[PDB]
């Protein structure tokens, strides 16, 4: 089965946040991302559909660098910072 869990490092200069967010909403069942400085979005996503790594590499091109992940959690958002999550938190 092709992977569903991917980490992606997305270049903001090549992919504005709103384009990334729309793609994540359309293609991810669950996702979260942070920002690290050229600013990059550091994404983890579980895709709705199994998708080959080669497909992911082609559709992101040099705008993002992706890799299937064996990690199965979004707990990086528990650290300090401003993160975007696909689900609703208590203060949202
Ligand atoms: Mn969604
Ligand atoms: Na958080
Ligand atoms: Na949230």
Author numbering: 2 to 38, 43 to 97
What does the study report here?
Replication initiator proteins (Reps) from the HUH endonuclease family process specific single-stranded DNA sequences to initiate rolling-circle replication in viruses. Smacoviridae is a family of small CRESS-DNA (circular Rep-encoding single-stranded DNA) viruses. Named after a triad of residues, the HUH motif in the nickase domain is most often made up of two histidines separated by a bulky hydrophobic residue (U), but can also be histidine–U–glutamine. Recent comparisons of CRESS-DNA Rep-domain protein sequences show that smacovirus Rep domains are both the smallest in size and the most divergent in sequence of the CRESS-DNA viral Reps.
The structure of the human smacovirus 1 Rep domain was obtained at 1.33 Å resolution and represents an expansion of the HUH endonuclease superfamily, allowing greater diversity in bioconjugation-tag applications. To uncover structural differences compared with other ssDNA-bound HUH-tags, attempts to co-crystallize the ssDNA-bound protein were performed by mutating the catalytic tyrosine (Tyr81) to a phenylalanine. This allows the coordination of the ssDNA but not covalent linkage to the ssDNA. The crystal belonged to space group P211. There was one protein molecule in the asymmetric unit. Modeling of ssDNA in the electron density adjacent to the catalytic domains, HUQ and tyrosine motifs for the bound/coordinated structure was also unsuccessful. The resulting unbound structure consists of β1, α1, β2, β3, α2, β4 and α3 secondary structures, with the β-sheets in an antiparallel layout. The catalytically dead phenylalanine substituting for the reactive tyrosine residue resides within α3 and the coordinating histidine and glutamine residues reside within β3. HSV1 Rep is also structurally different from WDV Rep and PCV2 Rep in that α2 and α3 have shorter disordered loops connecting the α-helices to the β-sheets. Another difference among the families compared here is in the orientation of the HUH/Q and tyrosine residues in the catalytic motifs, but this could also be explained by the absence of the divalent metal ion that is required to prime the active site for nucleophilic attack on the DNA substrate.
